[PDB]
Design an enzyme around this catalytic site. Structure first.
Site, PDB file in Angstrom:
ATOM      1  N   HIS A 165       0.824  -1.193   0.000  1.00  0.00           N
ATOM      2  CA  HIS A 165       0.000   0.000   0.000  1.00  0.00           C
ATOM      3  C   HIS A 165       0.864   1.251   0.000  1.00  0.00           C
ATOM      4  CE1 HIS A 165      -2.858   2.951   2.041  1.00  0.00           C
ATOM      5  NE2 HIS A 165      -3.693   2.409   1.171  1.00  0.00           N
ATOM      6  N   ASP A 197      -5.769  14.744  -1.752  1.00  0.00           N
ATOM      7  CA  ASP A 197      -4.664  13.934  -1.276  1.00  0.00           C
ATOM      8  C   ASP A 197      -3.428  14.811  -1.192  1.00  0.00           C
ATOM      9  OD1 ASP A 197      -3.324  11.649  -0.418  1.00  0.00           O
ATOM     10  OD2 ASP A 197      -4.296  10.403  -1.984  1.00  0.00           O
ATOM     11  N   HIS A 432      -8.261  11.303   1.165  1.00  0.00           N
ATOM     12  CA  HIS A 432      -7.282  10.241   1.058  1.00  0.00           C
ATOM     13  C   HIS A 432      -5.984  10.822   1.604  1.00  0.00           C
ATOM     14  CE1 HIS A 432      -5.180   6.884  -1.197  1.00  0.00           C
ATOM     15  NE2 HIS A 432      -6.133   6.269  -0.538  1.00  0.00           N
ATOM     16  N   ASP A 457       3.272  -0.351   4.296  1.00  0.00           N
ATOM     17  CA  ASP A 457       3.125   1.088   4.158  1.00  0.00           C
ATOM     18  C   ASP A 457       4.459   1.753   4.484  1.00  0.00           C
ATOM     19  OD1 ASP A 457       0.476   2.006   3.259  1.00  0.00           O
ATOM     20  OD2 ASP A 457      -0.278   0.969   5.054  1.00  0.00           O
TER      21      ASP A 457
END
Length: 494
Positions: A165, A197, A432, A457
């Site tokens: 991710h 974002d 996001h 991540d």
């Protein structure tokens, strides 16, 4: 120049994952927030960047973002290293990749390229690695002979729902762009309701830290290409898989400073790459808040798995970043809560830290994605404030104190970037960000959501009063300016 916030975070990482230093987390000095001269805040790559216009008509953010991507890649001399959630980069994201690589080749170089995407089992992959590799090769034209591609989609655990991710662009292990922006044209580019974002761009040793993290994912990815259920892999020019591209690039010379910004790079291995850091003496007293609106389906790695913590230091890193706040925290997220089942509803330690900040008179602002996107896993903002109340009472035994802290010290709202309640095309705003800011001194920008998730991540924590002032001016103050018209009034408040 003192760094109390990074100090506090590094303490927590050394306690949690001492053995993963140098691969999954690393603290460095000497970095530069990479801003084009003439635009000193240009290292902050937000999208779409159209504050005050429900028509999102002037998209300064997206512009600056795609051109920083192109230019970073156009300057590659040896290595280009890309990770994202599927699909593989398309639309303008792909044009940045192809223009950049063609320009790199034109400058006389032969770039080695890795592109990696995580795929949820649920997700059927339109453009598979071999299909995507052939598309890049066609678009690269005569340059393809000078470009060594590695292209792969991966899933580390089906039962535990782990896959990459992280959203990374690392060039020569010297520049790095990271954040919450996936290379998906339809969310961000070709739409009248772009996802809001933010990424950040930097140069220097923290970029090599990001490279070391990617080497760790490709080491796993290259070896597990023997199981197509987990990894699908395609290369160009008959090239081998390149698990240590960034280590080769780095050689044995240390990374050279480009500025004076101290940075902690911190990632996580999710589930199914590494069981534990056996180096670690991490022995937590974990909290057991019985969530009775969904007794967790799967084994709860977020709240009840010491081993998980040792291979996902980003979880504790975000907790200690919040906990290091002495004056105020701003949290800008898609969500704080996850969908249960199959994941736990929320991270208890995270909420206890926030509750502790409220009880201490620290100002807490939480801006999440509008629940009408449910791109949102709560049915109401009050699910956040009620959970903070529950933990407040659990920690103080004083509901009256809880109401004062919660009514006096909490700002909770759905995200908006203009005076309108929704985009001019009728769709709600989708937020996001994976952003945390503390005391106008230190901030996290990366891919790690604060809600429970067990993925690979990565992100950066910067400590810089000047940079955080820029973050405040360009993003947090605007966000609150428009988002406060969608503020919750929590139960028990006037």
């Amino acid at each position: 120049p003192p760094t109390p916030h990074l100090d506090a975070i590094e303490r927590s990482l050394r306690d949690t994952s001492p053995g993963l230093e140098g691969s999954v987390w690393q603290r460095t000095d000497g970095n530069r927030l990479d801003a084009p001269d003439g635009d000193p805040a240009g290292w902050l790559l937000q999208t779409p960047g159209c504050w005050g216009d429900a028509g999102c008509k002037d998209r300064a953010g997206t512009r600056r973002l795609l051109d920083k991507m192109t230019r970073n890649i156009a300057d590659a001399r040896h290595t280009v290293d890309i990770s994202s959630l599927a699909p593989f980069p398309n639309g303008g994201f792909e044009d940045a990749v192809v223009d950049g690589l063609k320009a790199s080749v034109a400058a006389g170089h032969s770039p080695r390229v890795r592109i990696l995407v995580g795929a949820a089992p649920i997700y059927h992959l339109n453009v598979v690695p071999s299909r995507y590799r052939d598309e890049l090769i066609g678009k690269l034209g005569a340059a393809a002979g000078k470009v060594t591609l590695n292209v792969a989609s991966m899933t580390t655990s089906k039962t535990s729902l782990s896959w990459n991710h992280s959203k990374l662009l690392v060039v020569d292990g010297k520049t790095a762009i990271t954040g919450g922006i996936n290379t998906n044209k339809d969310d961000y580019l070709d739409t009248a309701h772009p996802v809001s974002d933010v990424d950040m761009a930097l140069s220097g040793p923290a970029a090599r830290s990001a490279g070391k993290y990617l080497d760790t994912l490709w080491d796993w990815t290259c070896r597990n290409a023997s199981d197509p259920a987990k990894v699908w892999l395609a290369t160009s020019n008959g090239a081998s898989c390149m698990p240590s591209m960034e280590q080769d690039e780095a050689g044995s010379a240390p990374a050279e400073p480009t500025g004076d910004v101290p940075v902690i790079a911190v990632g996580g291995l999710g589930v199914g790459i590494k069981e534990s850091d056996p180096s670690s003496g991490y022995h937590p007293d974990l909290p057991t808040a019985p969530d009775t609106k969904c007794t967790v389906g799967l084994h709860d790695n977020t709240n009840a798995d010491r081993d998980y913590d040792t291979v996902n230091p980003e979880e504790n890193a975000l907790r200690s970043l919040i906990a290091s706040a002495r004056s105020h925290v701003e949290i800008s997220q898609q969500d704080l809560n996850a969908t249960c089942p199959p994941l736990p509803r929320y991270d208890i330690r995270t909420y206890d830290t926030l509750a502790g900040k409220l009880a201490a008179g620290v100002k807490v602002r939480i801006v999440v994605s509008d629940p009408a996107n449910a791109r949102s896993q709560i049915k109401s903002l009050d699910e956040i404030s009620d959970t903070l109340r529950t933990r407040l009472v659990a920690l103080t035994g004083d509901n009256e104190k809880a109401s004062r802290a919660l009514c006096g010290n909490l700002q909770l709202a759905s995200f908006r970037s203009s005076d309108a309640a929704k985009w001019a095309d009728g769709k709600p705003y989708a937020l996001h960000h994976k952003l945390v800011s503390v005391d106008d001194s230190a901030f996290y920008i990366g891919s790690k959501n604060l809600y429970p998730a067990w993925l690979q991540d990565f992100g950066y924590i910067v400590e810089s009063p000047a940079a955080a002032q820029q973050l405040k001016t360009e993003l947090l103050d605007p966000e609150w300016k428009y988002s406060q018209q969608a503020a919750a009034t929590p139960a028990g408040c006037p």
